[PDB]
């Protein structure tokens, strides 16, 4: 049952279909994502559903795209394993950022901005940074406070690792 799903999902994204019918496939990929106690169905369902939503005008595609990104981005912040949290956030391209600009999506990305793992933070600062043109009223303040926290880390922490990571960020 299980190891086949990985290659099926890889196929679904990795060569070019000419069916609208994909819109059902992406919404059924909400099942694969949320569940799958198997790590690999998740990490691949991610990498699929980012790829399939490239039609991101009219009002059906839009609700679908937005419905996915919520579920998709949830995993990018919330998922316990770091590797999925990296994969999801990295796949949220420039293609989407008019959906990431919404308050709610953006509130979630800021949680990523102070993650457990360093590499994810480095990613999220880049992401939020891209959007600071798009929806500046939310972003620009958060980024200012982030800047202050950063300069505080530089001056006042005696640890080298922290300063290193701080300057890098």
């Amino acid at each position: 049952x299980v190891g086949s799903i990985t290659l099926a999902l890889r196929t679904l994204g990795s060569f070019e279909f000419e069916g609208h019918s994909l819109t059902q496939f992406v919404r059924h990929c909400a099942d694969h994502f949320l569940n799958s106690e198997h790590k690999e169905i998740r990490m691949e369902a991610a990498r699929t559903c980012s790829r399939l939503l490239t039609p991101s005008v009219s009002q059906t595609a839009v609700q679908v795209v937005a419905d996915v990104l919520s579920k998709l981005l949830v995993v990018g912040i919330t998922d316990p394993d770091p590797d999925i949290r990296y994969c999801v956030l990295a796949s949220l391209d420039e293609r989407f950022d008019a959906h990431l600009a919404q308050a709610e999506n953006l509130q979630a990305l800021f949680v990523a901005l102070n993650d457990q793992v360093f590499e994810i933070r480095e990613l999220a600062i880049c992401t939020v940074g891209r959007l600071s043109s798009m929806n500046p009223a939310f972003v620009m303040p958060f980024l200012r406070k982030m800047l202050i926290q950063i300069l505080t880390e530089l001056e006042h922490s005696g640890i080298g690792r922290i300063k290193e990571q701080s300057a890098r960020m």
């Binding site: 308050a103 500046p136 202050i148």
Partner: protein
């Protein structure tokens, strides 16, 4: 392929009149009003501050906080200082409320306070009375529920029971305590309130309170803040907001900003286009936002909208809660707010200020002209971003009270009113939201404007509002708001799209509201309609017909001005129109024309029979919709001339016989609705 024949065919009987039922929309119990319009009438400034005499509780520091309404009292000699501080404290409340009696009491006796509070009762009599109590001069208030004042000779601190105080003050009231353990005063007040109710059955609802500090805590002694810290926040927010900005580690990244520069920020707190006014304007928007996104709707209304002074105090109290936190205090409030110190709209203020006074040495040395803040622009941008996707009923938009603030200027009014249209767009729910945030009186006031760019955008809003809330017809007729719209409907150059809405607005204003029927008549609406009656836009013909329709419902004067303009004559063209809706409206109007009369002789009767004869050739009409309305029109005629149709009916068991014949063809109808209602009318004769 055989798909091009398919897509290119007229689908008959698949439109709104067919699929949907011809019914009204069940309008909601719209509870957006503040009919509870309180007004703070008078103010007591009891101000125990025995200058140069530190009470035995707090042994103060060497460089302590010696400021006190932006005055060092010790620099002046005692009596001058105390009088001056009363003057300043009054000036600070005058910003927020300039039309109140300010009876300041300076180092007062018990009896003095009694005279004062009771006197202010008899003045204000049912309406809200402020009682500011400072108490830096006196010892800290006791667990007994006693607060301290003086005796006549200034030897002894006399106590003053809170029970006695709320005896003398009335129930609609509001207290501000700025003294060290002020939580104890809050607690004791709420206890002595219960004690009244329990003893009564053998206040608190109406009493608001604000208190500098919790019952445990002591106020700060910190040399660079003022000793008046809770008062100063409450009633000079921008002045401490800026000074407190300057004391943080935030200023590390605004180099060349000292406290001296903040003394001389140019502008004032009313001229919006000058750095001080700008910051003030921003501040207001921010605090109003933090309240509207945090508090439950009922409570938000109670505090932030009901009356000016209380609203100003609670807006500013949010700032106090944020500052005093950083010095181990917590302020207290009688309607207990949630904690708002962390709320992210503060970090907007922080940036807004940063920009708006990093730009300050360049102003104040060279004379570089003032460049406005991006705040309102960017904040409107966010609101725009939310409208794109967010037609949803998800979390509503955080910026909604900021949009309201932006309407108050020229600078961004056009952008805001468009965005407010594009929001009120989305349904009746969004109109319910914008009416709750208090958009209504600000929009209504813009009708008094004459900037020609607003005419499409106000029309567009007023359309969407009056769809949802028909009871706003009261407000528009009071202010001569109707004349604004009458002039838009008179314009031949304003596009058909918006003139449609204008006609609709005028229908709502006029709809069974007698004063509104009178006003719009005497603004020459019958002439305006009949010019636009024969347009090429079928909604407009429909709605402009409905205007005429509503304007002479049960209103005889409108019928007279109708007959002098030959309105009924001109309306006969719309009876053979290519859209049913236009015909419905036309029929509707010609019916309600007939419906009122007050028994007039030749002209009324002659005209009525001509109208009836012309309506009588709508029996062979396709839409039952028209035929329903047709039966209604004839029903109005029936209700007047009952004596005639009684005779004509009782015969069969020229003119009236034909009307009765029509009602038979309408009673014996293939569509059920038409047959039903035709039979109801004919049963009323029977």
């Amino acid at each position: 392929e055989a798909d091009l024949t398919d897509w290119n065919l007229p689908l008959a009987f698949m439109k709104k009149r067919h699929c949907e039922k011809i019914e009204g929309s069940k309008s909601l119990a719209q509870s957006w009003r503040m009919k509870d319009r309180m007004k703070t009438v008078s103010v007591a400034l009891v101000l125990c501050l025995n200058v140069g005499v530190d009470p035995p509780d707090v042994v103060k520091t060497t460089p302590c906080a010696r400021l006190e309404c932006w005055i060092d009292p010790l620099s002046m000699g005692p009596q001058k200082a105390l009088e001056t501080i009363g003057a300043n404290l009054q000036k600070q409340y005058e910003n927020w409320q300039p039309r109140a009696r300010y009876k300041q009491s300076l180092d007062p006796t018990v009896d003095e306070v009694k005279k004062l509070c009771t006197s202010l009762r008899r003045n204000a009599k049912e309406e809200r009375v402020l009682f500011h109590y400072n108490g830096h001069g006196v010892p800290r208030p006791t667990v007994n529920g006693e607060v301290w004042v003086f005796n006549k000779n200034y030897t002894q601190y006399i106590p003053l029971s809170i029970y006695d105080l709320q005896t003398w003050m009335g129930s609609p009231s509001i207290f501000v305590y700025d003294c060290s353990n002020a939580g104890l005063i809050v607690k004791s007040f709420k206890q002595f309130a219960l004690q009244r109710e329990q003893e009564l059955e053998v206040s608190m609802k109406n009493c608001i309170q604000l208190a500098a500090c919790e019952a445990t805590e002591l106020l700060p002694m910190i040399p660079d803040l003022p000793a008046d810290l809770f008062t100063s926040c409450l009633t000079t927010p921008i002045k401490i907001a800026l000074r407190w900005f300057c004391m943080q580690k935030c200023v590390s990244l605004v180099p060349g900003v000292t406290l001296d520069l903040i003394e001389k920020i140019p502008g004032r707190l009313n001229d919006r286009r000058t750095p001080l006014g700008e910051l003030n304007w921003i501040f207001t928007a921010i605090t109003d936002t933090i309240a509207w996104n945090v508090l439950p709707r009922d409570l938000f209304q109670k505090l932030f909208r009901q009356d000016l002074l209380v609203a100003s105090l609670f807006r500013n109290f949010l700032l106090a809660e944020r500052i005093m936190r950083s010095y181990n205090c917590t302020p207290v409030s009688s309607p207990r707010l949630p904690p708002t110190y962390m709320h992210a709209m503060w970090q907007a203020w922080d940036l807004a200020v940063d920009i708006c006074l990093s730009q300050l040495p360049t102003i104040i040395e060279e004379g570089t002209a003032f460049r406005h803040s991006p705040f309102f622009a960017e904040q409107l941008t966010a609101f725009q971003v939310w409208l794109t996707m967010g037609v949803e009923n998800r979390n509503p938009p955080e910026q909604l009270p900021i949009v309201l603030q932006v309407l108050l200027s020229q600078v961004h009014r056009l952008r805001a009113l468009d965005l407010l249209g594009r929001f009120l767009d989305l349904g009746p729910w969004a109109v319910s939201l914008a009416l709750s945030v208090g958009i209504f009186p600000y929009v209504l006031k813009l009708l008094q404007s004459s900037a020609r760019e607003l005419r499409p955008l106000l029309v567009f809003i007023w359309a969407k509002i009056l769809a949802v809330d028909s009871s706003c017809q009261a407000d528009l007729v009071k202010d001569n708001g109707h004349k604004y719209f009458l002039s838009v409907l008179a314009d031949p150059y304003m596009p058909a799209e918006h003139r449609t809405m204008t006609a609709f607005i005028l229908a709502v204003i006029v709809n069974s509201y007698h004063t509104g029927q009178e006003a719009c008549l005497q603004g020459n609406l019958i002439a305006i309609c009949l010019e636009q009656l024969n347009d090429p836009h079928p909604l407009l013909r429909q709605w402009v017909a409905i205007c005429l329709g509503r304007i002479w419902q049960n209103f005889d004067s409108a019928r007279w001005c109708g007959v002098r303009d030959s309105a009924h004559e001109k309306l006969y063209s719309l009876l053979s129109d290519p859209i049913p809706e236009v015909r419905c409206a036309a029929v509707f109007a010609l019916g309600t024309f007939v419906g009122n009369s007050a028994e007039r002789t030749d002209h009324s009767t002659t005209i009525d029979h001509n109208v009836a004869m012309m309506l009588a050739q709508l029996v062979s009409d396709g839409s039952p919709m028209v035929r329903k309305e047709l039966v209604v029109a004839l029903s109005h005629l029936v209700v007047q001339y009952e004596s005639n149709f009684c005779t004509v009916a009782l015969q069969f068991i020229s003119v009236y016989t034909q009307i009765w014949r029509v009602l038979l063809h309408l009673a014996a109808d293939p569509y059920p609705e038409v047959s039903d209602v035709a039979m109801k009318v004919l049963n009323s004769i029977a």
